Ligand SMILES: Cc1cc2nc3c(=O)[nH]c(=O)nc-3n(C[C@H](O)[C@H](O)[C@H](O)COP(=O)(O)OP(=O)(O)OC[C@H]3O[C@@H](n4cnc5c(N)ncnc54)[C@H](O)[C@@H]3O)c2cc1C
């Protein structure tokens with residue numbers, strides 16, 4: 001039989017969405033004054049983001065000339081090209097007297113393409129995929145080796161940023177692959193630990209590890225072999241992190257691995273060599289219905305094992321695959337929400353739960369969403385101290401938002417720390433991570449995609465998720481209905 005908290009997790013696995021969302025709503029609701037402050041801050045963060053290099057203000061003036069003379073796009077553009085040519089006349093007197101969407105962006109590296117594609121064509125296609133992967137993935141990778149990544153840390157660390165490094169690579173298929181990942185992780189801990197040089201788990205850099213890298217065919221692995229084989233590896237790495245006093249974070253992956261990951265964490269927290277050390281980190285995904293129940297479990301685990309757990313709250317990286325897997329298994333429901341706004345509500349409710357127990361949990365709020373960030377900033381309350389919480393972001397996505405956050409108040413920043421997640425590796429380790437970033441950046445529901453859509457007003461972009469849910473409820477007839485285009489698997 002399971003403990004009370006473990007049993008509650010299991011029972012919530014595929015809770016009906018009407019139920020799960022209805023339950024979260026009042027825990028996610030910000031009191032009116034807090035809601036108002038969160039809105040104003042979110043608005044201001046998002047405004048600066050958009051209007052970097054005057055993107056919006058330039059977009060204005062354009063529309064005016066593109067009307068005050070009655071013209072279309074190509075009309076205005078043509079008029080600019082001439083104006084530019086006229087502006088290149090040195091002397092004023094002389095002047096006065098006179099599938100293939102991002103094909104454009106792809107061209108700067110260099111309907112008729114459709115024929116070229118049909119023509120030019122599998123070893124080609126496989127080669128095309130590999131190079132496109134590298135080209136797009138570059139912006140998300142901090143270095144090829146941990147040494148290169150680390151030798152790059154000073155610039156942002158001196159501004160108050162922190163790092164968590166990820167030696168890319170996951171889902172080991174063979175015993176040999178898992179062993180190689182083990183060696184890579186170990187190597188990385190030695191390097192990060194030496195660089196950290198005693199700065200500790202808060203100020204100093206840490207590492208993020210995927211359990212799927214450390215065990216062959218983890219996706220279908222049984223408890224008995226995971227404990228016999230994976231656990232000693234997890235323990236070994238964590239002991240080494242502890243010797244260097246750096247944080248070590250256990251990544252959250254597919255939802256059917258949540259249970260085994262909790263079993264591993266439970267065992268890890270009771271190792272004698274880790275007594276009194278608070279550097280163990282664990283990620284939880286707010287897009288899961290189980291998330292708040294996992295928090296209750298974690299709170300009890302911190303108490304029983306006598307430590308402060310580092311808990312990274314994220315929304316989640318595997319949503320597309322989760323929906324697909326659930327539709328294939330034909331079960332009673334989904335282990336994740338089907339509307340993005342419900343994940344947002346879940347994240348806010350879970351953030352409140354984490355912030356309530358600062359003796360037991362150090363919350364690490366991973367997000368690139370300006371509203372989510374502003375809400376957490378307000379929910380954390382008055383009298384911030386550095387060890388209360390931190391924000392986190394992915395390299396290549398979070399820096400512009402967080403340049404308004406980490407740093408001095410005198411320089412116009414919020415003075416809250418952000419830990420940058422820093423992937424390290426060569427092209428052979430990049431694929432899976434890059435695909436997830438493509439899904440994240442390309443989704444019409446994602447904040448980073450919406451903020452780039454200048455037709456979407458700021459107020460809509462940073463709209464309160466709880467209010468959004470209640471708006472849906474008033475229109476649709478009940479709270480927390482599933483996405484209209486995502487029926488239950490058995491339907
Ligand atoms: C530093 C860092 C570490 C992370 N570590 C992990 C990890 O170990 N494991 C992991 O799984 N994730 C992890 N993530 C999260 C993941 O990689 C995405 O970055 C994150 O979910 C984006 O959230 P947001 O607040 O930035 O963006 P938003 O645009 O606010 O939120 C986007 C998220 O909404 C969710 N979503 C999208 N569509 C729907 C829908 N129709 N219904 C319900 N939910 C939906 C997805 O989770 C999506 O990522 C991490 C993120 C960061 C910044």
Ligand SMILES: O=C(O)[C@@H]1CCCO1
Pocket residue numbers: 251252317421433436437
């Ligand atoms: O691998 C991923 O896509 C997420 C983001 C960082 C770690 O887990």
